[PDB]
């Protein structure tokens, strides 16, 4: 029994209310922000890239990597729903399935095992867990993955900081701040290596 | 992240900084030793007499090893990027 | 004489993996030594494979064993004796259900499924 | 007393109210369309009673939703 | 075909909401903002120019450097629109072209190449890429270009700091901080070179 | 005498990959030992192939093996013997369902096939 | 005697890539060893190809010089290709090229 | 005798790039050495052409090989022999689909296109 | 629980960092004395000479003790986690 | 005889431009080495030009090559020979589609498109 | 023997501009030497002009060249020979479509537009 038109309007107007939650939890927006946040802290500049610019690039990145799932939602759920091929519940289920496939692809088993036991439900295959138990397992997996990526990017800047600090101690000028005398070299390394392109490419590549 | 890989990244980072810092300090360490030996032979006790020669050879070393240090830092960053898929499967 | 590995002090610088390997090897040695005192067995070797135990069936790996025996000059082990062998080995190692112990002999005749 | 069991139970409780609202609206719409099309055995009182019930039921659905959405926003926007 | 008056107002009122986003992403505000932050870091003072003043100068300069684009928007889009010579559809497209041309001129090929392959679209020439694939690329190139200009300005103040640090060390005083001694000379170098006119003119001239 | 690698002290210089290899090599050695004690076999050489078994929820690569045998001057192994060999080898190594092992002989006649 | 590479300690200066290559070398060498015990085969060489993590998929090529005479039957080449395929992780059996001294191809690729 | 490069130890100053080139040179050397085992051919020279690769790219190069041969004083390669040669070359290198090898000889009769 | 048990935890943690810092520093301290006594015997008065030798062994010590310090931090975290029941009970 | 550049070493001082140029020079020299063995040909000098590979066609530069030859005192190359040579060169270097190679001779008769 | 500059090592103190100029000189020397092998020419001097290939989406400057010759005491170049010369030169240098070279001689006869 399909829902009335008034309920269906009220149902999908509620989705707009929860739209920010979906981006920060069920999408790739979480990892991209974290990696660029750690990358900013790796360089000497404190808040030069700015939060709004970081979010802006992240929104474009999360839109480009979620296009296949968004296209699958449209071509499996939205189009049949607009063309009266399936009902409201079937359209809702058809839209959720590609979303669940994306979260399960980029998650960890141990994280899934941790949450299935606490919830207390039988599981025999990965593709049987409810979305209520997949969301907290997915974000935990993303945070660990984001931290690992941030660690790799941090190391080359740490090497420069150690070198420049040790060289100043070699001449004996201990009072001179390594941080000020290392910022130009940290910035230059990010330039000639062209960090702003490969790092975003790796973030896009890491999800696929 | 397995503990074995963490030590491997730690060691290669420490090995790289060790190579860079030793290549720079050694020209200053040799000159400082030579001046100290010279002072002992002539029996003089000036302290800062062995500062400017150390600074000159250190700056000259950085000019000569500019190409070498730049390439290694770029290579290392590229290596970590290429090693990323191995870290997270 | 299997316990010697345990009583030793592993030098600083052995990774965790190697530590687990050496503990497992000590257990294999002590199991083989215990089997040596069998009336019919004159030599034995045991090999182990550790489990993983992840609920999701498609991912659980389960433990395993493989024991080779060189018995006396003559005699053939009865079904009771090999059953006792597999039960002892299965109980000694945590988990590893007894239906996953592979036993052979000198002549190569199979003695237990894998 | 498991997480999946209670999650299903409250979902069953929630979907029952939604189905109850849907039943009232469909019944209200069915009575309206039969009277409007010219069926003789349909009284205006039955039409008016049903559509008043649906309005109250849908009004409760919107108000309950607003309480839940505001409650969700209150917990998410708190200064942790 | 042509949008109704009510829809035209709704679209125009929508763009006012995104006006801050277009300033920091689609204009010269970001590069000028970054350079002054690096220039401030190069000198010993970390909060002397003050954030409000720096953004105020950035807003005035971005008004001066975007004037050729804004005048083209006025001439091409607004004047035919107000005289009912083009529809609302044509006016919006005619306004977008000069803004897209400005962002295409300051971008980098590799940055465009990076996002084009990420967006999965078939592009033959850079001068016809979509807006959604140009904005992330343009801001990426601006950040990289900002770092290069910042490194240029950082060196002269770094040299002064190194010079004064070595002179103090030569005289045997290894406890006096070079930062205090270097600060008056860092300020003077920025004064007799007329830094606040030289830096801003170069930043404005960097978009020509 | 396979365990020599295990009891040895891996000095600074080993790096992840190598360690796994040596660990793998260790089992290979002792696996050869288990095959040698059989009367029919004179020499046995074992090679393994163990994939990563990724942490994310994906497919693994179904670990595999390849064992070569050199028997006595005459004689042929009956199928019971080769089944015992493949069961022992497959159960010794974690994973590798027994249908993923290649067994050959000195003359080169095939005995199984993953 | 293939394991000599593994039991040595790579001189410091090796860098990721080289290590992988050396490991590959080891496999190749010992695989050749296993082929030498074949009665029909007198000398053998194995070349490997494992892709870096459009996936390339793995590959191998085993080149043999047999004894003075004889030619390999399909059973023998089947055994050789099965052993090579199962020794290296991956590399489904249809991707191994087996040839001989005279140059008669024994397996596609 | 190609493996000499691999078992050597490069000194300080070899960048990642030169190292990759030397790896390619080593594989080319061993491929040519293996090809010399052909009864017909006296000398073979293998060149490779490999893209930068690295994952997370939009590679638009694809691989290539170029093998230049000198046969005996007489004799000519039959199409089956050159097919075997090109199959071996294509299977030796990761990638490089078999339709991307140029094979020539001492006289210049091309044996495969590209 | 009781404040004394917290003191035992904090003393145990400070004890571990003492072991961590000792393993790293002591190799550098020994080299510093070796060079200093050598300079005293040879009447060499270069105060900044014995910096790179201390840095080299310090970096080498970090690489050599990479596995042990990892195993120790992770097990300390597990030890605290398994000791959480003490707090809950 | 080309591999000297690769199998030598370069002291901290060769920058990235110089590294790329030297690698290209190794390519040129070894391709000339491959062409010397041609029975008809006596000397060949090869020049290269690396590509850029930008998706934007108006910005792409594309790879190029130019091979100059001095054959024997007599003989003139039949078009099959020049096609085989240009195919070898085209497959030798990554990129440079077979129509982006110029072939000339001692007398200056054009032998390929440019 | 243009390879002198490349295989030489620049001591520290050369600037980026000078490095590019030296590479350009190396290419010019080797191209002139390659042109010298031709029959009709006695000496050839090639000069280049390569802009910097801007990074952003700005239009570039379409690099150009200029080749000057002194030929044999007699003879005059026919259009085919000058076409082959200019095509080799244009293909050697990256960029510079073949219409952007000037060819001259000892007398000064113009042989290509510019």
From TrEMBL, chains A, E:
Its main location: membrane. The keyword Nucleus does not apply. It is found in: Cell membrane; Bacterial flagellum basal body. One of its GO terms (biological process) is bacterial-type flagellum organization. It is a multi-pass membrane protein. Belongs to the FliP/MopC/SpaP family. Plays a role in the flagellum-specific transport system. This is Flagellar biosynthetic protein FliP. It comes from Vibrio alginolyticus. The chain holds residues 81 to 288 of 289 of the full protein.
Automatic annotation (TrEMBL), chains B, I:
Keywords: Bacterial flagellum, Cell membrane, Cell projection, Cilium, Flagellum, Membrane, Transmembrane, Transmembrane helix. Signal peptide: none annotated. The chain crosses the membrane at residues 13-39, 51-70. PANTHER family: FLAGELLAR BIOSYNTHETIC PROTEIN FLIQ. Role in flagellar biosynthesis. Pfam families: Bac_export_3. This is Flagellar biosynthetic protein FliQ. NCBIfam families: fliQ. It is a multi-pass membrane protein. Belongs to the FliQ/MopD/SpaQ family. It is found in: Cell membrane; Bacterial flagellum basal body. InterPro entries: Bac_export_3, FliQ. The lineage of its organism: Bacteria, Pseudomonadati, Pseudomonadota, Gammaproteobacteria, Vibrionales. It comes from the Bacteria.
TrEMBL record, chain D:
GO terms for molecular function: cytoskeletal motor activity; structural molecule activity. The keyword GTP-binding does not apply. It comes from Vibrio diabolicus. GO terms for biological process: bacterial-type flagellum-dependent cell motility. It comes from the Bacteria. GO terms for cellular component: bacterial-type flagellum basal body. The chain holds residues 24 to 103 of 103 of the full protein. The gene is fliE. This is Flagellar hook-basal body complex protein FliE. It is found in: Bacterial flagellum basal body. Belongs to the FliE family.
UniProtKB/TrEMBL annotation, chain G:
It is found in: Bacterial flagellum basal body; Cell membrane. It comes from the Bacteria. Belongs to the FliF family. The basal body constitutes a major portion of the flagellar organelle and consists of four rings (L,P,S, and M) mounted on a central rod. The M ring is integral to the inner membrane of the cell and may be connected to the flagellar rod via the S ring. The S (supramembrane ring) lies just distal to the M ring. The L and P rings lie in the outer membrane and the periplasmic space, respectively. The M ring may be actively involved in energy transduction. This is Flagellar M-ring protein. It comes from Vibrio alginolyticus.
């Amino acid at each position: 029994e399909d829902y009335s038109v008034t309920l269906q309007i009220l149902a999908l107007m509620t989705m707009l209310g929860f739209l920010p939650a979906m981006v920060i939890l069920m999408t790739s927006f979480t990892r991209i922000v974290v990696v660029m946040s750690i990358l900013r802290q790796a360089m000497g500049l404190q808040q030069t890239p700015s939060n709004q610019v970081i979010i802006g690039i992240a929104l474009f990145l999360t839109f480009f990597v979620m296009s296949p799932v968004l296209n699958e939602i449209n071509d499996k759920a939205v189009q049949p729903y607009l063309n009266e091929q399936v009902t409201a519940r079937e359209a809702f289920d058809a839209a959720q399935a590609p979303m669940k496939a994306f979260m399960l692809k980029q998650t960890r088993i141990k994280d899934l095992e941790t949450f299935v036991t606490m919830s207390g439900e039988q599981v025999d295959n990965p593709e049987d867990v409810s979305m209520a138990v997949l969301i907290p397992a997915f974000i935990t997996s993303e945070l660990k993955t984001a931290f690992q990526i941030g660690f790799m990017l941090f190391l080359p800047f740490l090497i420069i900081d150690l070198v420049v600090a040790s060289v100043l101690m070699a001449m004996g000028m201990m009072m001179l701040s390594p941080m000020i005398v290392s910022l130009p070299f940290k910035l230059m390394l990010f330039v000639l290596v062209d960090g702003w392109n490969l790092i975003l490419s790796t973030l896009a590549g890491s999800f696929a | 992240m397995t503990p074995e890989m963490f030590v491997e990244l730690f060691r290669e980072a420490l090995w790289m900084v060790l190579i860079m810092v030793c290549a720079i300090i050694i020209p200053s360490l040799l000159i400082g030793l030579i001046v100290a030996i010279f002072q002992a032979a002539t029996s003089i006790n000036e302290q800062t007499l062995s500062f400017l020669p150390r600074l000159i050879v250190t700056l000259l070393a950085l000019m000569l090893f500019g190409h070498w240090m730049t390439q290694m830092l770029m290579e290392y960053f590229y290596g970590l990027i290429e090693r990323l898929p191995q870290v997270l499967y | 004489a299997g316990d010697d590995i345990l009583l030793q002090d592993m030098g600083f610088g052995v990774s965790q993996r190697l530590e687990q390997e050496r503990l497992k090897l000590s257990r294999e040695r002590q199991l083989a030594q215990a089997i040596e005192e069998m009336k019919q067995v004159r030599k034995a070797r045991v090999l182990l494979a550790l489990p993983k135990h992840s609920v999701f069936v498609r991912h659980n790996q389960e433990a395993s064993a493989s024991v080779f025996l060189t018995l006396s000059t003559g005699t053939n082990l009865k079904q009771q004796e090999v059953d006792s062998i597999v039960d002892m080995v299965a109980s000694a190692v945590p988990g590893m259900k007894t239906s996953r112990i592979t036993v052979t002999d000198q002549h190569g005749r199979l003695l237990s499924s894998g | 007393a498991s997480g999946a069991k209670v999650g299903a139970d409250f979902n069953d409780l929630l979907t029952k109210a939604i189905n109850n609202v849907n039943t009232l609206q469909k019944a209200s719409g069915d009575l309206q369309t039969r009277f409007d099309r010219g069926d003789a055995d349909v009284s205006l009182s039955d039409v008016m009673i049903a559509r008043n019930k649906s309005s109250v039921a849908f009004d409760a659905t919107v108000q309950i939703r607003n309480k839940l959405v505001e409650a969700y926003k209150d917990l998410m926007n708190m200064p942790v």
